[PDB]
Amino acid sequence: ASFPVEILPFLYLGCAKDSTNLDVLEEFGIKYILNVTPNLPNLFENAGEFKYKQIPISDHWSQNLSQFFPEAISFIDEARGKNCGVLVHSLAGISRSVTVTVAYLMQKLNLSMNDAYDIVKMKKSNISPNFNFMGQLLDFERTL
Ligand SMILES: [Cl-]
Numbered sequence: 001a002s003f004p005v006e007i008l009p010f011l012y013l014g015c016a017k018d019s020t021n022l023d024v025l026e027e028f029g030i031k032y033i034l035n036v037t038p039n040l041p042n043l044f045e046n047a048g049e050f051k052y053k054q055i056p057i058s059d060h061w062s063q064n065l066s067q068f069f070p071e072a073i074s075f076i077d078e079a080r081g082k083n084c085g086v087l088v089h090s091l092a093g094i095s096r097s098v099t100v101t102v103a104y105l106m107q108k109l110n111l112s113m114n115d116a117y118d119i120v121k122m123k124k125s126n127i128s129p130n131f132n133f134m135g136q137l138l139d140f141e142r143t144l
Helices: 022-027 066-081 095-108 113-123 134-142
Strands: 005-008 011-014 030-035 043-047 050-054 085-089
Touching (some): 005 113, 011 095, 022 030, 030 066, 066 095, 066 134, 095 113, 095 134
Parallel strands (some): 011 085, 030 050
Antiparallel strands (some): 005 011
16 A cells, blocks of 8 residues: 655655565665664574664663664665665654654755754655654754
C-alpha cells in the first residue's frame, strides 16, 4: 500500500507501516539498510543483495540516540556517495528513523533542526513523530 519516501536522492525513509519488500527495495536501487528498531544487537553484515546495519538502541528513557548519529551519518553518506539507495527504517514507528534522517540533513546540508525537519516535511507532509527526540536534535545542533 505505501512505500519508502525519497527525502534526498539515494536517501529513503520508511515508516513502520511501509512495504519493506525486497523486490521493492531492489527496484528503488536501495542496497543499504539502516535499522533503528530498538532492543536489537549491534550488527553490520551483508544480507542477500544488501548491506544491513542494526544499531543497539534501547527503548529505555535514558537511551541516547544521538551518540549513534556519527556512525549513522557515515553509513548513509557512504551509500549516497556510491550512488546507492540507503533506507532508514524502524519497525517501532517513525520517530527514530526521521530523527536519524533529520540529523543527517542537519550535518550534510548544514541546516538547523527546524530547517532540516521542514525539508523532510516537503517530501513526506503526512509524517507525525513524537517529541522524544527534540532535545537530542537541538543539542546536536549546537555540535555544528
Ligand atoms: Cl521508532
